[PDB]
Amino acid sequence: SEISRVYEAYPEKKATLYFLVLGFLALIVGSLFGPFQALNYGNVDAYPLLKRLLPFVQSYYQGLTLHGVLNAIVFTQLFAQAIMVYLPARELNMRPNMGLMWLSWWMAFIGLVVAALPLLANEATVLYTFYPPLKGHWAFYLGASVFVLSTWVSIYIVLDLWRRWKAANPGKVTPLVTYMAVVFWLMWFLASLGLVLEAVLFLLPWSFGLVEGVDPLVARTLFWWTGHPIVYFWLLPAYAIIYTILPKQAGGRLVSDPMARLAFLLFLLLSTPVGFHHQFADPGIDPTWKMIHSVLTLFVAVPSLMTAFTVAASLEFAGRLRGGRGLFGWIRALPWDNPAFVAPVLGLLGFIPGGAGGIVNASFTLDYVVHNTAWVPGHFHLQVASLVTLTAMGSLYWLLPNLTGKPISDAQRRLGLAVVWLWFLGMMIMAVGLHWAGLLNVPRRAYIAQVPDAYPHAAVPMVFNVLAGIVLLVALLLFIYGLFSVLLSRERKPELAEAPLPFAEVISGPEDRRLVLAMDRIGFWFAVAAILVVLAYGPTLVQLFGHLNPVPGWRLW
Amino acid sequence: DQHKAHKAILAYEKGWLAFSLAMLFVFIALIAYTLATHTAGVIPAGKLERVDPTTVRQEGPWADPAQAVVQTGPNQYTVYVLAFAFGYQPNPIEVPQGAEIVFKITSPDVIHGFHVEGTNINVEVLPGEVSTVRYTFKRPGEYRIICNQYCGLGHQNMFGTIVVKE
Amino acid sequence: EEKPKGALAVILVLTLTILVFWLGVYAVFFARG
Ligand code: HAS
Ligand code: HEM
Ligand code: CUA
Ligand SMILES: [Cu+]
C-alpha cells in the first residue's frame, strides 16, 4: 500500500512521528502568546497587536489559558507518549500493540480538539489549573479528561511490551530504557488518579449541568495529587533521553545503569505524595500534613541531584575521551556544534538555578515568601520551558532522521544552534526578570501592563522581561522556519532513517548485578508507591469528604 | 579508565547522596525552626472553618464592614475580611501596630489571594471557607494588599490596603 | 582514569546556588516576619 512502505515493518515510527508533530504544533501555538506575556511582565501591552494579528483572543487571560494548556499540558503530554513508547519499543526491537497505539493518538486529538474549541471561543478561560469555582465550558473538561485518559492507553501499551519481552526472556533483567518507561507509566498511573477523580467526581457533573457546585478545597486537593507528579511526568522523558542517549551524542558512555534505575525508582516512590507543597497557603489543611509533604518534597529533590552527578560525570568522561584536559578541558571538547547535544545540555544548565528555586518553594514557611508571585513562573520556565522543552527540541536532530528518513542539511543544523542558543539566553534573561520581580511582590497571572504605575520597584526586572520578550519572539520564529523547513522538505535520503536511535553504552560494574536485580522488583515498589499515596493524601481526603461544601461556579471573564 | 572509573564513581555518588541528605536536613531543621517561633503565625488555620459564600456578605461578621475589626485579647484583634470579585472589604483595614492581628478571610465568589505586601501574610482565599492567619504588625504605616490568584477579569486590579496605625 | 573533578565542580556550583537561594530566601522570610 506504501511507497514509503516503512509502516508494515516499523509502523511505530508512524505513530511516534504523528504524536510528536502534535506536541510541536501545540508548542508552536501556545508559545505564540508567551512573548506577549513576556512584554506584559515587561510592562508593555502587546495585546493591541496580538489582538489584531490573531483576532479571536479576547483577554490576556485566554492567552495565558492557551499558552498554559497547550504548552504545558498538551505539548509535554504528546512528547512523553512519543518518547516513553518509541524508545522502550526499540531497545526491545519489539512492535507496540499498534491497534491501541492509534487509539492512543486518536483519543489525544479528539480530546485536544473537543477541548480546544471552547478555548478559542473564550468559553473556558479558567487557566491550565481550572481551579473551581471559576467555571469552564463542559467541552473543556470532557475534552481534557479524555486527552489525559489517552495516557492510560499508553500505560497499557508499554506494559504490553514489558509483559511479552519477559515471555521471550525468562531470568533476564529489564533493559534500562524499557525499565525506565515501566516505572514511569506506573508512576503516572498512581499520579493520574487525582485529576481523574476530580474530573469524574466533580468537574464533569458540575459543568454538564448535573450539579450546582464543587467544594473548592477538595477540587484543588484532587487537582494537586496529579498536578505535581505531572511535572515529573514532563521531565522524565527528557531524563530517559539525557541518561541513555545524550552521553553517546556527547562522545561517550553513561557511567551507571544502576544509578539511572535508582533515580527512576525514586520518582515512582516520591513523585505523587507531595502535592501539598502546592497548598502551603491553603486553608483547612493541617500544618503537620503540609510539613510532611514538605519533608517528602525534599526527598524527591534527591533523585534529581544524584542525576546531576551521574549525568555531569558522563559528559565529563566523554569530555576527556575527545581529548579534554583541564578542570574544564572536558567541557569545550564536547560537540558544541550539535543541536542534539547543545539543547538538553543548555537546558540542564538553567536546571541548576531552577532546582534551587523548587527547593525554596518546597520549604513550607519559605513558600509564604514567594507563593503566587512571578517567582514561580521563574522556577517553572527554567524547568519545563527550558529543560524538558530544549531536550525535546534537540531531539529533532536525531528522532526526525530516525522517523522520517529526512536528514539535517548543514544549514538547518546551523539554524538549530542559533535557536537553541537564542531560546536558552532568552529563558535565562526571562528567569532573572521573573524571579526578581517575583521577590518585589509582583503577583502572577496578571495583566500588570494594564496597571502600569503599580509596580514602581519592578522597573529594572521589567526590562529583562521586555528583552527576553523580543529574544524568545525571535527565537520562536527561527524555530518555526526551521521546524517547517526540516519537514517541508521532499529530499529524504532514509539510509539514516532505518538507522537506530543513538543509545549509549553503559559502563558496567560488578555491583550492577545484585543491586539492579533488587530495583527490578517492579510490582512490589509500585505497591509501596500506592502505600505512600494512601498514607499521604489519606487522612486528608478522609476529612474533606466527611465535610464537603460545594459552592456555585462563576464565570468572571 | 573503563572499570577503574566505575568504582570511583560509585563511591563518589555515595559521598554526594550523603552530603545532599545532611544539607537537606539542616534545611528541615531550619524550616522547623521557623515553625516554632512567632513567624509561623502566617500558616493557615488547619481546622476546617465552613461558611456560605452566598450569605457571607449579608449575614455574619463579614456582612457589616464597620464591624470587621473585633478586639479579642488585651492585645488581640480579629479582622474579618472579604475578598470578592475585585476588591477587599474593609478598605482600608485599620489595625494598631504592636498588636496580634488575626485575619479571618473568605469569599462570596471564586478564590482570590491575600498577599499583604511586605510580610509573609500570603493566604489563599477560598469560597466556602475561612482562612485564618496571625500577624503582628511591627512597624506602622501602609501595607498594600495584592490579590495573587487569578479570580477572573478584574484580577490585575484587585488590591486593598492595610493601615497599621502609629 | 582519575578523580572526576569536572562533575564535582558541577555539584559544587550546584550546591552553592542551592545555598545562595535557600539562605537568601530564609533571610527575606525573616525581614518580612
Ligand atoms: C517539569 C518540571 C518541574 C520540575 C523540574 C520541577 C522540579 C521541582 N519543583 Fe516545581 N515547584 C515546587 C518544588 C519543586 C521541587 C523541589 C522540584 C525538584 O524536582 C527539583 C530537583 C532538581 C534539582 C536539585 C536540580 C538538579 C540539577 C541538575 C540535575 C542539573 C545538573 C547539570 C548538569 C549535569 C549539566 C552539566 C553540563 C555541563 C556542560 C557543565 C513547589 C514547591 O514545592 C512549587 C509550588 C510553589 C508555589 O508557591 O506555587 C512548584 C511549582 C511548579 C509548577 C508551577 C505549578 C503551578 O502553576 O502552581 C510547575 C510549573 C513546576 C514544574 C516543575 N518543577 N513547579
Ligand atoms: C516564547 C516562550 C515563552 C515565553 C516568552 C513564556 C512566558 C511566560 C510568561 C511571561 C508567563 C506568565 C505571566 C503570568 O503569570 O500571567 C508564562 C506562564 C506559563 N508558561 Fe510560559 N512562556 C514561554 C514558553 C513556555 C513553555 C515552553 C512552557 C512549557 C511548555 C510554558 C509553560 C507555562 C505555564 C504552565 C505558565 C502558567 C500559566 C498559568 O499561570 O496557569 N511556557 N509564560
Ligand atoms: Cu481576586 Cu485575582
Ligand atoms: Cu510540585
mmCIF file of C-alpha atoms in Angstrom, chain A residues 97-413:
data_model
loop_
_atom_site.group_PDB
_atom_site.id
_atom_site.type_symbol
_atom_site.label_atom_id
_atom_site.label_comp_id
_atom_site.label_asym_id
_atom_site.label_seq_id
_atom_site.Cartn_x
_atom_site.Cartn_y
_atom_site.Cartn_z
ATOM 1 C CA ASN A 97 0.376 -3.127 20.069
ATOM 2 C CA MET A 98 -0.384 -0.735 17.173
ATOM 3 C CA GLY A 99 -4.224 -1.191 17.368
ATOM 4 C CA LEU A 100 -4.091 0.510 20.766
ATOM 5 C CA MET A 101 -1.392 3.000 19.798
ATOM 6 C CA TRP A 102 -3.599 4.694 17.195
ATOM 7 C CA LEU A 103 -6.478 4.649 19.780
ATOM 8 C CA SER A 104 -3.977 6.472 21.999
ATOM 9 C CA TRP A 105 -3.220 9.073 19.258
ATOM 10 C CA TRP A 106 -6.903 9.434 18.365
ATOM 11 C CA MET A 107 -8.077 9.937 21.923
ATOM 12 C CA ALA A 108 -5.430 12.642 22.182
ATOM 13 C CA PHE A 109 -6.524 14.515 19.096
ATOM 14 C CA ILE A 110 -10.185 14.200 19.694
ATOM 15 C CA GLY A 111 -9.611 15.203 23.369
ATOM 16 C CA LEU A 112 -7.478 18.177 22.318
ATOM 17 C CA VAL A 113 -9.935 19.291 19.633
ATOM 18 C CA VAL A 114 -13.089 18.619 21.728
ATOM 19 C CA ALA A 115 -11.324 20.911 24.260
ATOM 20 C CA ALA A 116 -9.503 23.432 22.076
ATOM 21 C CA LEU A 117 -12.883 24.599 20.764
ATOM 22 C CA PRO A 118 -14.381 26.298 23.890
ATOM 23 C CA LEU A 119 -10.904 27.794 24.398
ATOM 24 C CA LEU A 120 -10.507 29.645 21.113
ATOM 25 C CA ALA A 121 -14.153 30.512 21.637
ATOM 26 C CA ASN A 122 -13.359 32.232 25.059
ATOM 27 C CA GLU A 123 -15.723 29.999 26.962
ATOM 28 C CA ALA A 124 -13.214 28.325 29.204
ATOM 29 C CA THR A 125 -10.714 30.974 30.422
ATOM 30 C CA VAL A 126 -10.006 29.245 33.747
ATOM 31 C CA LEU A 127 -6.241 28.615 33.336
ATOM 32 C CA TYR A 128 -4.382 25.295 32.987
ATOM 33 C CA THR A 129 -5.471 24.649 36.606
ATOM 34 C CA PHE A 130 -9.176 25.345 36.087
ATOM 35 C CA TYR A 131 -9.430 25.885 39.868
ATOM 36 C CA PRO A 132 -13.158 25.804 40.659
ATOM 37 C CA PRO A 133 -15.305 27.734 41.287
ATOM 38 C CA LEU A 134 -14.211 29.653 38.093
ATOM 39 C CA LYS A 135 -16.453 27.571 35.745
ATOM 40 C CA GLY A 136 -15.455 26.236 32.361
ATOM 41 C CA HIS A 137 -17.466 25.069 29.352
ATOM 42 C CA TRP A 138 -18.269 21.326 29.614
ATOM 43 C CA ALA A 139 -16.341 20.701 26.357
ATOM 44 C CA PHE A 140 -13.220 21.855 28.124
ATOM 45 C CA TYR A 141 -13.383 19.278 30.910
ATOM 46 C CA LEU A 142 -14.522 16.263 28.874
ATOM 47 C CA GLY A 143 -12.030 17.487 26.257
ATOM 48 C CA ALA A 144 -9.130 17.478 28.746
ATOM 49 C CA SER A 145 -10.254 14.328 30.710
ATOM 50 C CA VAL A 146 -10.248 12.178 27.517
ATOM 51 C CA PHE A 147 -6.904 13.539 26.197
ATOM 52 C CA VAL A 148 -5.400 12.647 29.616
ATOM 53 C CA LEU A 149 -7.123 9.209 29.625
ATOM 54 C CA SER A 150 -5.270 8.934 26.325
ATOM 55 C CA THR A 151 -2.268 8.037 28.550
ATOM 56 C CA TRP A 152 -3.907 5.141 30.258
ATOM 57 C CA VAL A 153 -3.851 3.567 26.750
ATOM 58 C CA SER A 154 -0.127 4.213 26.550
ATOM 59 C CA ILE A 155 0.358 2.814 30.150
ATOM 60 C CA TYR A 156 -1.134 -0.481 28.969
ATOM 61 C CA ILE A 157 0.714 -0.444 25.606
ATOM 62 C CA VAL A 158 4.032 -0.140 27.356
ATOM 63 C CA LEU A 159 3.098 -2.733 29.999
ATOM 64 C CA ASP A 160 2.157 -4.857 26.994
ATOM 65 C CA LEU A 161 5.681 -4.612 25.590
ATOM 66 C CA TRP A 162 7.074 -5.437 29.042
ATOM 67 C CA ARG A 163 4.751 -8.397 29.620
ATOM 68 C CA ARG A 164 5.739 -10.146 26.349
ATOM 69 C CA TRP A 165 9.510 -9.279 26.259
ATOM 70 C CA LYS A 166 9.622 -11.171 29.544
ATOM 71 C CA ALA A 167 7.810 -14.151 27.920
ATOM 72 C CA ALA A 168 10.615 -14.168 25.363
ATOM 73 C CA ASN A 169 13.325 -13.753 28.117
ATOM 74 C CA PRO A 170 12.826 -15.726 31.388
ATOM 75 C CA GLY A 171 15.506 -14.953 34.044
ATOM 76 C CA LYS A 172 16.535 -11.699 32.301
ATOM 77 C CA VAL A 173 16.764 -8.155 33.770
ATOM 78 C CA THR A 174 14.586 -5.416 32.283
ATOM 79 C CA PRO A 175 16.787 -3.467 29.862
ATOM 80 C CA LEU A 176 17.268 0.181 31.023
ATOM 81 C CA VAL A 177 15.105 2.277 28.777
ATOM 82 C CA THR A 178 12.260 -0.284 28.989
ATOM 83 C CA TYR A 179 12.696 -0.395 32.739
ATOM 84 C CA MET A 180 12.602 3.359 32.951
ATOM 85 C CA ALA A 181 9.321 3.572 30.983
ATOM 86 C CA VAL A 182 7.634 0.866 33.127
ATOM 87 C CA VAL A 183 8.356 2.577 36.426
ATOM 88 C CA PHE A 184 7.448 5.778 34.535
ATOM 89 C CA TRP A 185 3.907 4.821 33.290
ATOM 90 C CA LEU A 186 3.138 3.112 36.703
ATOM 91 C CA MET A 187 4.091 6.301 38.392
ATOM 92 C CA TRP A 188 1.903 8.295 36.082
ATOM 93 C CA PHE A 189 -0.920 5.934 36.815
ATOM 94 C CA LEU A 190 -0.914 6.435 40.566
ATOM 95 C CA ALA A 191 -0.499 10.150 39.927
ATOM 96 C CA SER A 192 -3.176 10.350 37.232
ATOM 97 C CA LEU A 193 -5.862 9.344 39.727
ATOM 98 C CA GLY A 194 -6.127 12.754 41.307
ATOM 99 C CA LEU A 195 -7.177 14.841 38.370
ATOM 100 C CA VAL A 196 -9.243 11.808 37.163
ATOM 101 C CA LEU A 197 -11.104 11.577 40.494
ATOM 102 C CA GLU A 198 -11.604 15.424 40.288
ATOM 103 C CA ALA A 199 -12.828 15.304 36.598
ATOM 104 C CA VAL A 200 -15.344 12.434 37.115
ATOM 105 C CA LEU A 201 -16.486 13.067 40.676
ATOM 106 C CA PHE A 202 -16.805 16.856 40.257
ATOM 107 C CA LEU A 203 -15.690 18.722 37.184
ATOM 108 C CA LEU A 204 -17.913 16.899 34.646
ATOM 109 C CA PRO A 205 -21.244 16.701 36.642
ATOM 110 C CA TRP A 206 -20.834 20.312 37.628
ATOM 111 C CA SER A 207 -20.031 21.536 34.044
ATOM 112 C CA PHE A 208 -22.517 19.282 32.220
ATOM 113 C CA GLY A 209 -25.272 20.995 34.255
ATOM 114 C CA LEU A 210 -25.662 17.949 36.536
ATOM 115 C CA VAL A 211 -24.831 19.862 39.816
ATOM 116 C CA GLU A 212 -24.656 23.484 41.046
ATOM 117 C CA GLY A 213 -21.314 23.207 42.924
ATOM 118 C CA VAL A 214 -17.851 21.795 43.681
ATOM 119 C CA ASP A 215 -16.234 22.218 47.124
ATOM 120 C CA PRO A 216 -13.180 24.107 46.038
ATOM 121 C CA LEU A 217 -10.904 22.765 48.808
ATOM 122 C CA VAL A 218 -11.328 19.244 47.528
ATOM 123 C CA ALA A 219 -11.424 20.387 43.868
ATOM 124 C CA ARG A 220 -7.838 21.563 44.276
ATOM 125 C CA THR A 221 -6.528 18.870 46.607
ATOM 126 C CA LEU A 222 -7.563 16.300 43.988
ATOM 127 C CA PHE A 223 -6.103 18.540 41.324
ATOM 128 C CA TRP A 224 -2.646 18.637 43.072
ATOM 129 C CA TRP A 225 -2.481 14.897 43.601
ATOM 130 C CA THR A 226 -1.849 14.675 39.867
ATOM 131 C CA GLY A 227 -0.698 18.273 39.187
ATOM 132 C CA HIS A 228 2.607 17.862 40.908
ATOM 133 C CA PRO A 229 3.740 14.413 39.555
ATOM 134 C CA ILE A 230 2.728 15.692 36.036
ATOM 135 C CA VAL A 231 5.803 17.950 36.083
ATOM 136 C CA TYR A 232 7.727 14.755 36.874
ATOM 137 C CA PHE A 233 5.880 13.130 34.019
ATOM 138 C CA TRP A 234 7.000 16.048 31.736
ATOM 139 C CA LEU A 235 10.529 15.780 32.983
ATOM 140 C CA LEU A 236 11.269 12.094 32.892
ATOM 141 C CA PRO A 237 11.005 11.570 29.204
ATOM 142 C CA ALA A 238 13.885 14.177 28.927
ATOM 143 C CA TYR A 239 15.778 12.220 31.627
ATOM 144 C CA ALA A 240 15.438 8.966 29.521
ATOM 145 C CA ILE A 241 16.847 10.948 26.580
ATOM 146 C CA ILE A 242 19.527 12.568 28.879
ATOM 147 C CA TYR A 243 20.607 9.413 30.774
ATOM 148 C CA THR A 244 20.732 6.975 27.796
ATOM 149 C CA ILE A 245 21.160 8.885 24.584
ATOM 150 C CA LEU A 246 22.848 12.181 25.342
ATOM 151 C CA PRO A 247 26.117 10.723 26.579
ATOM 152 C CA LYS A 248 26.572 8.980 23.181
ATOM 153 C CA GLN A 249 25.775 12.141 21.230
ATOM 154 C CA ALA A 250 28.359 13.514 23.662
ATOM 155 C CA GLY A 251 31.198 11.241 22.572
ATOM 156 C CA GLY A 252 30.771 8.911 25.460
ATOM 157 C CA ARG A 253 29.152 6.246 27.621
ATOM 158 C CA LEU A 254 26.697 6.572 30.549
ATOM 159 C CA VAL A 255 28.632 5.733 33.732
ATOM 160 C CA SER A 256 25.965 3.727 35.620
ATOM 161 C CA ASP A 257 22.996 1.590 34.662
ATOM 162 C CA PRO A 258 22.207 1.049 38.335
ATOM 163 C CA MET A 259 22.248 4.805 39.188
ATOM 164 C CA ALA A 260 19.746 5.733 36.482
ATOM 165 C CA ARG A 261 17.407 2.902 37.521
ATOM 166 C CA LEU A 262 17.908 4.095 41.104
ATOM 167 C CA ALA A 263 16.760 7.691 40.302
ATOM 168 C CA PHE A 264 13.812 6.497 38.229
ATOM 169 C CA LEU A 265 12.771 4.084 41.018
ATOM 170 C CA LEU A 266 12.708 7.135 43.358
ATOM 171 C CA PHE A 267 10.372 9.097 41.018
ATOM 172 C CA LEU A 268 7.907 6.197 41.401
ATOM 173 C CA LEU A 269 8.247 6.381 45.163
ATOM 174 C CA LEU A 270 8.205 10.074 45.873
ATOM 175 C CA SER A 271 6.623 11.893 42.924
ATOM 176 C CA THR A 272 3.000 11.583 43.933
ATOM 177 C CA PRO A 273 2.620 12.013 47.758
ATOM 178 C CA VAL A 274 3.986 15.530 47.778
ATOM 179 C CA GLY A 275 1.493 17.973 46.335
ATOM 180 C CA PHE A 276 0.600 19.906 49.490
ATOM 181 C CA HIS A 277 3.728 21.908 48.718
ATOM 182 C CA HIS A 278 1.227 23.452 46.188
ATOM 183 C CA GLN A 279 -1.106 24.141 49.164
ATOM 184 C CA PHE A 280 1.232 25.629 51.780
ATOM 185 C CA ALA A 281 -1.116 28.640 51.655
ATOM 186 C CA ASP A 282 -4.383 26.706 51.618
ATOM 187 C CA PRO A 283 -6.912 26.880 54.415
ATOM 188 C CA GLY A 284 -8.364 23.817 56.134
ATOM 189 C CA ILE A 285 -5.284 21.742 55.579
ATOM 190 C CA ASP A 286 -3.421 20.621 58.607
ATOM 191 C CA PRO A 287 0.047 22.231 59.222
ATOM 192 C CA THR A 288 1.574 18.792 60.036
ATOM 193 C CA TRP A 289 0.424 17.273 56.715
ATOM 194 C CA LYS A 290 1.888 20.329 54.954
ATOM 195 C CA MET A 291 5.142 19.769 56.995
ATOM 196 C CA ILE A 292 5.256 16.033 55.969
ATOM 197 C CA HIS A 293 4.857 16.775 52.210
ATOM 198 C CA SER A 294 7.404 19.475 52.857
ATOM 199 C CA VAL A 295 9.680 16.625 54.029
ATOM 200 C CA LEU A 296 8.714 14.196 51.268
ATOM 201 C CA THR A 297 9.358 17.013 48.582
ATOM 202 C CA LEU A 298 12.853 17.473 49.960
ATOM 203 C CA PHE A 299 13.432 13.718 49.465
ATOM 204 C CA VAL A 300 12.128 13.932 45.990
ATOM 205 C CA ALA A 301 14.783 16.512 45.097
ATOM 206 C CA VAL A 302 17.325 13.810 45.868
ATOM 207 C CA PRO A 303 16.990 11.603 42.733
ATOM 208 C CA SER A 304 17.376 14.736 40.702
ATOM 209 C CA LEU A 305 20.619 15.708 42.357
ATOM 210 C CA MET A 306 22.004 12.219 42.002
ATOM 211 C CA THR A 307 21.100 12.821 38.353
ATOM 212 C CA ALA A 308 23.381 15.933 38.488
ATOM 213 C CA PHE A 309 26.355 13.766 39.325
ATOM 214 C CA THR A 310 25.642 10.757 37.021
ATOM 215 C CA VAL A 311 24.920 12.987 34.059
ATOM 216 C CA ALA A 312 27.730 15.522 34.708
ATOM 217 C CA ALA A 313 30.267 12.740 35.220
ATOM 218 C CA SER A 314 29.262 11.059 31.953
ATOM 219 C CA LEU A 315 29.602 14.334 29.989
ATOM 220 C CA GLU A 316 32.895 14.772 31.854
ATOM 221 C CA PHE A 317 34.286 11.324 30.934
ATOM 222 C CA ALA A 318 33.327 11.945 27.205
ATOM 223 C CA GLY A 319 34.992 15.361 27.504
ATOM 224 C CA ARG A 320 38.216 13.521 28.360
ATOM 225 C CA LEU A 321 37.567 10.905 25.682
ATOM 226 C CA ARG A 322 37.559 13.756 22.958
ATOM 227 C CA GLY A 323 40.846 14.958 24.494
ATOM 228 C CA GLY A 324 39.555 17.298 27.215
ATOM 229 C CA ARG A 325 42.251 18.017 29.840
ATOM 230 C CA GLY A 326 41.744 20.869 32.269
ATOM 231 C CA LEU A 327 39.355 21.005 35.148
ATOM 232 C CA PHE A 328 37.196 22.425 32.321
ATOM 233 C CA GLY A 329 39.071 20.885 29.457
ATOM 234 C CA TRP A 330 36.378 18.213 29.289
ATOM 235 C CA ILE A 331 33.765 20.890 28.515
ATOM 236 C CA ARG A 332 34.922 22.625 25.362
ATOM 237 C CA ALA A 333 35.719 19.132 23.928
ATOM 238 C CA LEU A 334 32.076 18.167 23.842
ATOM 239 C CA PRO A 335 30.401 18.740 20.474
ATOM 240 C CA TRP A 336 29.011 22.256 20.880
ATOM 241 C CA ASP A 337 28.195 22.225 17.216
ATOM 242 C CA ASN A 338 25.424 19.646 17.689
ATOM 243 C CA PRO A 339 21.812 20.687 18.438
ATOM 244 C CA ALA A 340 21.019 17.108 19.647
ATOM 245 C CA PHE A 341 23.581 17.829 22.297
ATOM 246 C CA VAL A 342 23.641 21.555 22.827
ATOM 247 C CA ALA A 343 19.870 21.645 23.620
ATOM 248 C CA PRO A 344 19.482 19.403 26.687
ATOM 249 C CA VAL A 345 22.901 20.471 27.974
ATOM 250 C CA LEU A 346 21.930 24.126 27.909
ATOM 251 C CA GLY A 347 18.614 23.041 29.437
ATOM 252 C CA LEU A 348 20.500 21.205 32.128
ATOM 253 C CA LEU A 349 22.420 24.399 32.974
ATOM 254 C CA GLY A 350 19.422 26.530 33.875
ATOM 255 C CA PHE A 351 18.178 23.460 35.771
ATOM 256 C CA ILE A 352 20.777 24.300 38.447
ATOM 257 C CA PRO A 353 19.166 27.658 39.225
ATOM 258 C CA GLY A 354 15.735 26.050 38.544
ATOM 259 C CA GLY A 355 16.099 23.347 41.198
ATOM 260 C CA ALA A 356 17.330 25.777 43.776
ATOM 261 C CA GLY A 357 14.039 27.522 43.040
ATOM 262 C CA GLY A 358 11.992 24.368 43.723
ATOM 263 C CA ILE A 359 13.802 23.601 46.974
ATOM 264 C CA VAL A 360 12.990 27.012 48.381
ATOM 265 C CA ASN A 361 9.347 26.805 47.239
ATOM 266 C CA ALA A 362 9.235 23.347 48.946
ATOM 267 C CA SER A 363 10.375 24.553 52.290
ATOM 268 C CA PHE A 364 6.786 25.224 53.690
ATOM 269 C CA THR A 365 7.097 28.530 55.567
ATOM 270 C CA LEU A 366 9.574 29.848 52.959
ATOM 271 C CA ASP A 367 6.809 29.404 50.436
ATOM 272 C CA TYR A 368 4.845 32.256 52.019
ATOM 273 C CA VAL A 369 7.626 34.426 50.739
ATOM 274 C CA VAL A 370 7.074 33.719 47.014
ATOM 275 C CA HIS A 371 3.867 31.712 46.560
ATOM 276 C CA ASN A 372 1.781 33.014 43.651
ATOM 277 C CA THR A 373 4.474 35.569 42.646
ATOM 278 C CA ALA A 374 6.360 35.937 39.375
ATOM 279 C CA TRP A 375 8.995 33.941 41.289
ATOM 280 C CA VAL A 376 7.036 30.795 40.422
ATOM 281 C CA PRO A 377 6.962 31.101 36.663
ATOM 282 C CA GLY A 378 10.654 31.963 37.057
ATOM 283 C CA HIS A 379 11.227 28.494 38.598
ATOM 284 C CA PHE A 380 8.959 26.668 36.263
ATOM 285 C CA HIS A 381 10.131 28.094 32.978
ATOM 286 C CA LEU A 382 13.676 27.043 33.917
ATOM 287 C CA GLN A 383 12.383 23.516 34.416
ATOM 288 C CA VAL A 384 9.894 22.694 31.652
ATOM 289 C CA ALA A 385 10.114 25.673 29.324
ATOM 290 C CA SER A 386 13.939 25.226 29.049
ATOM 291 C CA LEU A 387 14.959 21.807 30.328
ATOM 292 C CA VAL A 388 12.092 19.438 29.179
ATOM 293 C CA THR A 389 11.444 21.593 26.131
ATOM 294 C CA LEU A 390 15.037 22.131 24.878
ATOM 295 C CA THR A 391 15.678 18.378 25.287
ATOM 296 C CA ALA A 392 12.607 17.977 23.007
ATOM 297 C CA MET A 393 13.960 20.500 20.516
ATOM 298 C CA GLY A 394 17.459 18.975 20.299
ATOM 299 C CA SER A 395 15.946 15.557 19.718
ATOM 300 C CA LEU A 396 14.610 16.565 16.352
ATOM 301 C CA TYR A 397 18.200 16.345 15.155
ATOM 302 C CA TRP A 398 18.026 12.582 15.622
ATOM 303 C CA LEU A 399 14.422 11.456 16.105
ATOM 304 C CA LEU A 400 13.452 13.168 12.847
ATOM 305 C CA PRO A 401 16.015 11.401 10.712
ATOM 306 C CA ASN A 402 15.175 8.150 12.623
ATOM 307 C CA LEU A 403 11.473 8.661 11.964
ATOM 308 C CA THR A 404 11.293 10.492 8.599
ATOM 309 C CA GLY A 405 14.451 9.497 6.830
ATOM 310 C CA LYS A 406 14.766 13.254 6.278
ATOM 311 C CA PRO A 407 18.364 14.400 7.020
ATOM 312 C CA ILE A 408 19.671 17.622 8.557
ATOM 313 C CA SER A 409 21.267 19.890 5.991
ATOM 314 C CA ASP A 410 24.322 21.593 7.413
ATOM 315 C CA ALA A 411 22.448 24.941 7.247
ATOM 316 C CA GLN A 412 19.391 23.575 9.029
ATOM 317 C CA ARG A 413 21.890 22.374 11.607
#
